[PDB]
Write an enzyme that holds these catalytic residues in place. Structure first.
Site, mmCIF file in Angstrom:
data_model
loop_
_atom_site.group_PDB
_atom_site.id
_atom_site.type_symbol
_atom_site.label_atom_id
_atom_site.label_comp_id
_atom_site.label_asym_id
_atom_site.label_seq_id
_atom_site.Cartn_x
_atom_site.Cartn_y
_atom_site.Cartn_z
ATOM 1 N N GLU B 366 19.125 13.245 9.080
ATOM 2 C CA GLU B 366 17.720 13.499 8.719
ATOM 3 C C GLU B 366 17.361 14.890 9.178
ATOM 4 O OE1 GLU B 366 14.868 14.073 10.652
ATOM 5 O OE2 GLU B 366 13.278 13.669 9.110
ATOM 6 N N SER B 567 -11.400 22.165 -19.480
ATOM 7 C CA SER B 567 -12.138 20.901 -19.296
ATOM 8 C C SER B 567 -11.335 19.872 -18.516
ATOM 9 C CB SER B 567 -12.482 20.277 -20.637
ATOM 10 O OG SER B 567 -13.159 19.042 -20.457
ATOM 11 N N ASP B 605 6.271 -7.606 -11.384
ATOM 12 C CA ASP B 605 6.886 -6.400 -12.041
ATOM 13 C C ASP B 605 5.834 -5.339 -12.374
ATOM 14 O OD1 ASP B 605 9.485 -7.538 -11.727
ATOM 15 O OD2 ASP B 605 9.798 -7.770 -13.938
ATOM 16 N N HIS B 628 6.530 12.861 -8.677
ATOM 17 C CA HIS B 628 5.279 12.077 -8.661
ATOM 18 C C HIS B 628 4.165 13.032 -9.076
ATOM 19 C CE1 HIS B 628 2.316 9.145 -7.221
ATOM 20 N NE2 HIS B 628 3.329 8.367 -6.849
HETATM 21 N N1 LIG Z 1 11.949 15.656 10.027
HETATM 22 C C1 LIG Z 1 12.662 16.878 10.094
HETATM 23 C C2 LIG Z 1 13.785 17.135 9.130
HETATM 24 N N2 LIG Z 1 13.013 17.866 8.100
HETATM 25 O O1 LIG Z 1 12.001 17.083 7.443
HETATM 26 C C3 LIG Z 1 12.143 17.455 6.041
HETATM 27 O O2 LIG Z 1 11.386 16.946 5.246
HETATM 28 N N3 LIG Z 1 13.087 18.371 5.879
HETATM 29 C C4 LIG Z 1 13.696 18.540 7.071
HETATM 30 O O3 LIG Z 1 14.687 19.171 7.373
HETATM 31 C C5 LIG Z 1 12.014 18.052 10.680
HETATM 32 O O4 LIG Z 1 10.805 18.039 10.418
HETATM 33 O O5 LIG Z 1 12.585 19.039 11.256
HETATM 34 ZN ZN LIG Z 2 13.055 12.326 13.282
HETATM 35 ZN ZN LIG Z 3 13.419 15.425 14.236
#
Ligand SMILES: N[C@@H](Cn1oc(=O)[nH]c1=O)C(=O)O
Ligand SMILES: [Zn+2]
Ligand SMILES: [Zn+2]
Ligand SMILES: *[C@@H]1O[C@H](CO)[C@@H](O[C@@H]2O[C@H](CO)[C@@H](O[C@@H]3O[C@H](CO)[C@@H](O)[C@H](O[C@@H]4O[C@H](CO)[C@@H](O)[C@H](O)[C@@H]4O)[C@@H]3O)[C@H](O)[C@H]2NC(C)=O)[C@H](O)[C@H]1NC(C)=O
Ligand SMILES: *[C@@H]1O[C@H](CO)[C@@H](O[C@@H]2O[C@H](CO)[C@@H](O[C@@H]3O[C@H](CO)[C@@H](O)[C@H](O[C@@H]4O[C@H](CO)[C@@H](O)[C@H](O)[C@@H]4O)[C@@H]3O)[C@H](O)[C@H]2NC(C)=O)[C@H](O)[C@H]1NC(C)=O
Ligand SMILES: *[C@@H]1O[C@H](CO)[C@@H](O[C@@H]2O[C@H](CO)[C@@H](O)[C@H](O)[C@H]2NC(C)=O)[C@H](O)[C@H]1NC(C)=O
Ligand SMILES: *[C@@H]1O[C@H](CO)[C@@H](O[C@@H]2O[C@H](CO)[C@@H](O)[C@H](O)[C@H]2NC(C)=O)[C@H](O)[C@H]1NC(C)=O
Ligand SMILES: *[C@@H]1O[C@H](CO)[C@@H](O[C@@H]2O[C@H](CO)[C@@H](O)[C@H](O)[C@H]2NC(C)=O)[C@H](O)[C@H]1NC(C)=O
Ligand SMILES: *[C@@H]1O[C@H](CO)[C@@H](O[C@@H]2O[C@H](CO)[C@@H](O)[C@H](O)[C@H]2NC(C)=O)[C@H](O)[C@H]1NC(C)=O
Ligand SMILES: *[C@@H]1O[C@H](CO)[C@@H](O[C@@H]2O[C@H](CO)[C@@H](O)[C@H](O)[C@H]2NC(C)=O)[C@H](O)[C@H]1NC(C)=O
Ligand SMILES: *[C@@H]1O[C@H](CO)[C@@H](O[C@@H]2O[C@H](CO)[C@@H](O)[C@H](O)[C@H]2NC(C)=O)[C@H](O)[C@H]1NC(C)=O
Ligand SMILES: *[C@@H]1O[C@H](CO)[C@@H](O)[C@H](O)[C@H]1NC(C)=O
Ligand SMILES: *[C@@H]1O[C@H](CO)[C@@H](O)[C@H](O)[C@H]1NC(C)=O
Ligand SMILES: *[C@@H]1O[C@H](CO)[C@@H](O)[C@H](O)[C@H]1NC(C)=O
Ligand SMILES: *[C@@H]1O[C@H](CO)[C@@H](O)[C@H](O)[C@H]1NC(C)=O
Ligand SMILES: *[C@@H]1O[C@H](CO)[C@@H](O)[C@H](O)[C@H]1NC(C)=O
Ligand SMILES: *[C@@H]1O[C@H](CO)[C@@H](O)[C@H](O)[C@H]1NC(C)=O
Ligand SMILES: N[C@@H](Cn1oc(=O)[nH]c1=O)C(=O)O
Ligand SMILES: [Ca+2]
Ligand SMILES: [Ca+2]
Ligand SMILES: [Cl-]
Ligand SMILES: [Cl-]
Ligand SMILES: [Zn+2]
Ligand SMILES: [Zn+2]
Lengths: 689, 689
Positions: B366, B567, B605, B628
């Site tokens: 992440e 508009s 659904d 989105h």
């Molecule tokens: N949660 C993280 C990792 N980060 O969040 C994202 O959305 N891109 C990313 O690298 C941070 O904030 O450093």
């Molecule tokens: Zn985190």
């Molecule tokens: Zn983090």
């Protein structure tokens, strides 16, 4: 009972004949009042026939029409600027007959003059032959090309990229006059004054040129014409073979490279450029004054709500707009849809409803680039993608009287085979035999003994947005001749009338009835079968054939495959996996607790979303609206389906690419996308948890 | 019974404390052996806890790491090339403690030297102030910016476009040192040697930089680094405020434009460029030698199959990788997920199964750009889009101890309100009161009396691909402080330890327990409620607020709206329609024959696909992976959600556009897309046939 047989028996040849007569007395050109009036008639009749709701869906889309007071024509012009020969301003109307004169829809305006180059069918390989082998340069030339073999818009795109300043299309008797048959009105052949109208845009699935991605509704923001989708940059015009003879007879320069470049006219078929010595100073001059204009079009949408799964849609659609009278195209199909609606409405009045919802569509502006189907599908895409079971097209029911012609997803192979085994053959000599028997005999599968040919879906008709953009299982069926992509001789000509059909194609309307049975029977089974009538194993079979085929194309270049480490292993792995998983899913489908509707539906959803899984949300390279990874319309011929199109296009003419490392890198990228997509689709058929 | 209460009661503060200790003894950096070992531990434990299946899903993705033998640092360099000041090579480790030193992930290598410009928080408006008002040019300068207010990658993108040749990020005590609290280890404040690590890529939703659109599996074809997604072109490095003081103290040139540019250090906060007269010949020199390398990452995916709708997925996911020990980020969240898995597994062992399938995920990487969640969602997108009910994130459970913080789709508002009314408040002074009561008092809605604030979803965490790319209803909840986008002081620093949490945040683990109840309770209701717990009327309410808001932004430019006929009528029409149709659907949902599972499912659904309907398959302008139409991460701050993003971005800074006709044409285009999408989503809630 109210079963398929009850449905089928209700269908009548006589009713199809009456509707066909009714739909073909006056022209129904898209965007004209006569076509709006026919829309309103169909809307009323479908209500009377029993449908739950029948609405008009309208859109304002870019159409194209000749200028009524400033006619299009081509000349041979002498050195002094005198026009010494002019092509016809209209086709001689048939006996007893707002007929739009012959033109090429969406041609830009212009009056280019220059020397002719003859380019055979204006195919990619024809231009390769000219430029690479014959060293003939088309830049600033007017190209003349015979119709046939590929979609006309591919010809124009090819001519434009070759540097042509105009294109003249004509119908050669080699392709449009069958030996031993008389010209209309005395037979089904094309007369020398006959001409084939048609759109020459290359939209690649976009729909209305001004609003790609979004429906052309009341508040739509529109591209300025300069940014419009698929508009040709050079004038184009179609002519008959009397007129073509006059343009071709004086041609000089190089001789035709071989016999496959010679048509049936009494001319040398010299490639040019220009005319032989005596006439070397004469030029050809086009005069094109057509205009593009935003115009309202109307689709008729009828609903027969399902009794059990109203949120599952089986769609039968075909177009209503015609170039002139539309005696075959589209009214032989629209009359068949009308009788199918009538038959389903008869069951409904007696208390029956199908299991799933059936939607019936009379599309507008098919002839201008699939505009009505496409705008409606853009408007309804969320509903279609989450609820669309299948789409069955219904353009011309007959283009001949020899045998059946079916193009469809592998998911529908078993359905088609089964249904045709249950239907009587209309064919001479096959009385008391099944349609499957006559069809398989007359159109044998190239792969399997005792199986009929079923072709791939590319484009060239209203199923395109449903299959190629949205990934809804689609099919089509019609009667055909014994010239596959060229059309029957009177295609898109004023001579395509009710009398052509009644006299020379189908006097008893038995071939029409057979097609009503195939199309209606498919819709019936799709809308009523408890388990959807799709066999995923049939997809596994063709995926292996397509993988062998694309591999074999690549293996024309062994040295490069070695240099760039080009492996098809991932693709064959994914195919093997699909085959294994589909075999197990089919076992479960036969095994599953048949008392459990949630298991049944999960399974029906797995079946319905299988076509959907071949869709890549990023689309194919430079064709964002063709999103199916297994099939696309051929980049060389919109009418032909191509398999593994992304890999096929990456390989095409690769030995000519200046940067082989880059070109082969892209082949490998496309193999990765294909393998991944095949595996991901397989995984939708795994147990869900 | 086996109801929500049984689930909730099983959850224990003590267990959360034990897991948190267990997950935070050694670093778990993405792509390292220690993180693979923790993955395998979680996989084993989830199996032991009762899940039906628990698998590792691995991918090979681009990561970034300092060079262990060639450390990153910044210098002040004198005229002779002597480095007279050097920043720290590591943070002083905490008492009693493979700690990766502070760096900016994905920084390119380089040793740029030059004059400093101080740019406050490096926001769009900060660069506007510099360039437009102060006429200070950043081209070829090294920019120094304080962390806070916006995602760090937005700062770097802003610096790059301003022409900077390097960026130095630092933590100012104004933003990272709360008055009256001690620095770690004696309080929760950031010490002067502390530094915040973090990714500086701007991927806009792509995932692994090398494989946008497709999972980074074994046979993936990879972009060459030069074509990689979101890679900065200038070196970047983070430092603490002791080191920042040394860089800022000598700054000359222009004074800060106003007080909002001054932090808390004893320095003038002069903008520069460069140092005051005496030191005018000294420069700043960065030395960055980090390398990007394709590295294997591992997600843990656990399945608890649903008893009735196994093909409907409710997902609880949060990451496992940390910068160092991850005492808050992410292990305070991962410990909560672990205890939720344990509790659901306890019910399952006693014979219970949820109605729908619950998937649990321990995501990897992440911290390097949402890589593990994104690659998994790319691999499984077809399954997720047709089967995904909801996604509940589970990063840090606590970032403070004041009150609850919830960001979620409007579809989950009623669920959150209801659930929090049933839960006890952990707060001092609210004993015997509901969590809803303490939350609403401490974080009042700006719009409604007696309602709590719930914020929009942008990005900055693993829900991004599910919500912004795929359109699966998502939510998140955590405890927070009374600096919203800046982070708690010890964020991404070595000081973020188990002891920080146990001593200074949550000694009783009662706030952790409250968050386990909110997250677990949401998953419970989503996975078990007969009718999905979504209220479409709540979407109608916010759509009107968003439409008023974007209209009000446009109306800052009345002359242009007159000139270009801009508009918003279509958008307010679509909103009105949505509101009407949602009201009727809700009536039917309360009315429907509750004995009918097919009607129930059609309705479930409709509910599940409503979020899906806001997805545009063409994506937002130049951000194909944000699809989105109602929400996107702000183009100025990834952490902030923006409403009607396509119209917002078309309007932003429009008075500065050189071609107003073009700029306003694009505003109108975005209004059309938004109106169309709102209406199409409304139409999914109409009767199906
Ligand atoms: N949660 C993280 C990792 N980060 O969040 C994202 O959305 N891109 C990313 O690298 C941070 O904030 O450093
Ligand atoms: Zn985190
Ligand atoms: Zn983090
Ligand atoms: C068809 O269905 C097959 C499942 O029946 C599926 O098989 C998987 O194949 C992948 C890729 O080949 C296997 O990946 C290996 O995974 C193991 C861990 O399980 C790794 O240790 C191994 O890592 C490497 O070995 C590599 C090859 O030399 C090397 O490049 C790396 O550096 C590392 O050393 C592989 O990543 C996977 O385990 C198989 N899954 C099974 C049997 O469950 C096929 O992929 C599938 N076909 C497609 C096209 O999806
Ligand atoms: C909210 O829901 C409304 C339905 O309750 C829906 O209303 C439709 O609005 C459209 C566009 O305004 C209407 O379109 C008209 O359709 C009629 C035929 O039914 C046409 O004759 C008419 O044509 C024109 O009049 C135009 C306006 O001056 C002019 O530009 C043209 O040249 C031509 O003369 C319009 O096309 C439609 O009938 C309404 N449907 C109903 C009531 O069923 C809203 O569109 C919907 N909001 C959104 C954003 O979708
Ligand atoms: C095609 O058939 C339709 C429907 O039977 C005919 O339209 C009807 O004609 C009668 C007599 O003029 C009218 O009173 C009705 O209102 C029409 N019904 C409709 C429009 O549903 C139409 O005349 C036929 N066209 C041709 C060429 O025969
Ligand atoms: C081909 O058509 C053109 C266009 O109508 C004819 O040329 C015109 O002839 C009239 C009457 O002689 C002149 O006054 C116009 O100025 C001409 N317009 C042109 C040249 O563009 C031409 O005669 C026709 N050729 C044949 C063989 O019939
Ligand atoms: C085409 O018909 C064949 C032959 O009836 C169907 O295949 C049979 O289906 C039943 C029901 O599952 C099985 O018990 C038989 O074993 C099948 N026979 C075979 C495969 O030879 C087939 O399902 C039909 N295709 C459809 C309905 O799409
Ligand atoms: C975190 O907890 C896990 C699981 O209880 C511990 O791992 C176990 O340790 C024992 C003793 O070394 C081994 O025999 C087991 O194989 C491990 N179980 C697993 C991996 O599931 C681990 O020691 C704990 N870590 C810390 C830092 O306390
Ligand atoms: C900052 O660090 C640099 C790099 O290590 C130091 O400069 C080095 O010092 C050694 C020993 O004097 C020299 O032999 C190297 O050639 C130097 N390398 C350079 C200049 O890049 C420098 O002394 C440090 N500065 C301070 C204030 O400690
Ligand atoms: C939040 O709880 C409210 C109050 O119980 C629920 O609203 C009630 O739902 C029942 C069942 O449909 C209705 O009969 C009542 O009229 C509703 N009361 C109202 C609207 O004040 C609501 O459904 C819950 N939200 C969920 C479960 O998402
Ligand atoms: C058609 O013919 C003439 C030629 O310019 C002219 O009077 C009229 O503008 C044209 N109509 C168009 C361009 O639609
Ligand atoms: C074709 O002819 C034109 C002459 O103007 C030229 O511009 C073009 O490059 C030529 N191409 C070749 C390959 O002869
Ligand atoms: C219809 O069938 C007969 C039988 O061969 C044939 O003579 C006739 O040409 C066919 N009609 C068409 C248009 O093919
Ligand atoms: C790390 O440090 C030095 C500096 O070039 C060198 O020995 C080694 O190549 C570097 N490692 C990398 C680039 O991964
Ligand atoms: C900023 O400075 C550099 C000087 O090299 C120049 O290239 C750039 O155009 C300048 N911009 C402005 C607006 O001063
Ligand atoms: C926890 O709560 C108390 C109560 O105000 C407070 O003194 C302490 O600062 C809080 N901890 C954090 C890290 O905010
Ligand atoms: N069926 C038509 C219309 N046409 O088919 C397409 O697919 N595009 C297009 O204009 C024709 O072939 O002329
Ligand atoms: Ca459109
Ligand atoms: Ca990827
Ligand atoms: Cl057809
Ligand atoms: Cl979170
Ligand atoms: Zn047609
Ligand atoms: Zn046609």
């Amino acid at each position: 009972k109210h079963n398929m047989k009850a449905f089928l028996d209700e269908l009548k040849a006589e009713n199809i004949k009456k509707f066909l007569y009714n739909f073909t007395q006056i022209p129904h050109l898209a965007g004209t009042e006569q076509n709006f009036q026919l829309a309103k008639q169909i809307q009323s009749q479908w209500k009377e026939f029993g449908l739950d709701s029948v609405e008009l869906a309208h859109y304002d889309v870019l159409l194209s029409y000749p200028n009524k007071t400033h006619p299009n024509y081509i000349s041979i012009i002498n050195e002094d600027g005198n026009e010494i020969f002019n092509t016809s301003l209209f086709e001689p109307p048939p006996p007893g007959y707002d007929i739009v004169p012959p033109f090429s829809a969406f041609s830009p305006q212009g009056m280019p003059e220059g020397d002719l180059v003859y380019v055979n069918y204006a195919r990619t390989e024809d231009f390769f032959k000219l430029e690479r082998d014959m060293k003939i340069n088309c830049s600033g030339k007017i190209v003349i090309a015979r119709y046939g073999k590929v979609f006309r818009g591919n010809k124009v795109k090819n001519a434009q990229l070759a540097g042509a300043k105009g294109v003249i299309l004509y119908s050669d008797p080699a392709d449009y006059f069958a030996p031993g048959v008389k010209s209309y009105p005395d037979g089904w052949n094309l007369p020398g004054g006959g001409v084939q109208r048609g759109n020459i845009l290359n939209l690649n699935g976009a729909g209305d040129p001004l609003t790609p991605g979004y429906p052309a509704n009341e508040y739509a923001y529109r591209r300025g014409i300069a940014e419009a989708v698929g508009l040709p940059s050079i004038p184009v015009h179609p002519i008959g073979y009397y007129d073509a003879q006059k343009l071709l007879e004086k041609m000089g320069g190089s001789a035709p490279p071989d016999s496959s470049w010679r048509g049936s006219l009494k001319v040398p078929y010299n490639v040019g450029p220009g005319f032989t010595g005596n006439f070397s100073t004469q030029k050809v001059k086009m005069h094109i004054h057509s205009t593009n204009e935003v115009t309202r079009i109307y689709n008729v949408i009828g609903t027969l709500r399902g009794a059990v799964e109203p949120d599952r849609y089986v769609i039968l659609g075909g177009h209503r707009d015609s170039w002139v009278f539309g005696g075959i195209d589209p009214q032989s199909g629209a009359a068949v849809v009308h009788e199918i609606v009538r038959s389903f409405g008869t069951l409904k009045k007696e208390g029956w409803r199908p299991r799933r919802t059936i939607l019936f569509a009379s599309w507008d502006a098919e002839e201008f680039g699939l505009l009505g189907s496409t705008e409606w599908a853009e408007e309804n895409s969320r509903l279609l993608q989450e609820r669309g079971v299948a789409y069955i097209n219904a353009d011309s029911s007959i283009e001949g009287n020899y045998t059946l012609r079916v193009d469809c997803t592998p998911l529908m192979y078993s359905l088609v085979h089964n249904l045709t085994k249950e239907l009587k053959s209309p064919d001479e000599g096959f009385e008391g035999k099944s349609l499957y028997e006559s069809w398989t005999k007359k159109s044998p599968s190239p792969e399997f003994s005792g199986m009929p040919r079923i072709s791939k879906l590319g484009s060239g008709n209203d199923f395109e947005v449903f299959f190629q953009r949205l990934g809804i299982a689609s099919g089509r069926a019609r009667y055909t001749k014994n010239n596959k992509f060229s059309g029957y001789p009177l295609y898109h000509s004023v001579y395509e009338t009710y009398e052509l059909v009644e006299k020379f194609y189908d006097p008893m309307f038995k071939y029409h009835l057979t097609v009503a049975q195939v199309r209606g029977g498919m819709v019936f089974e799709l809308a009523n079968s408890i388990v959807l009538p799709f066999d995923c194993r049939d997809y596994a079979v063709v995926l292996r054939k397509y993988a062998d085929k694309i591999y074999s194309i690549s293996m024309k270049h062994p040295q490069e495959m070695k240099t760039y480490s080009v492996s098809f292993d991932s693709l064959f792995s994914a195919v093997k996996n699909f085959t294994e998983i589909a075999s197990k899913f089919s076992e479960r489908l036969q095994d599953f607790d048949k008392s459990n509707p949630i298991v049944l539906r999960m399974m029906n959803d797995q079946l319905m979303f299988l076509e959907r899984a071949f869709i890549d949300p990023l689309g194919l390279p430079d064709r964002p609206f063709y999103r199916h990874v297994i099939y696309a319309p051929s980049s060389h011929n919109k009418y032909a389906g191509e398999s593994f199109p992304g890999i096929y296009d990456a390989l095409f003419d690769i030995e000519s690419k200046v940067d082989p490392s880059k070109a082969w890198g892209e082949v490998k990228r496309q193999i990765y996308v294909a393998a991944f997509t095949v595996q991901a689709a397989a995984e939708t058929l795994s147990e869900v948890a």
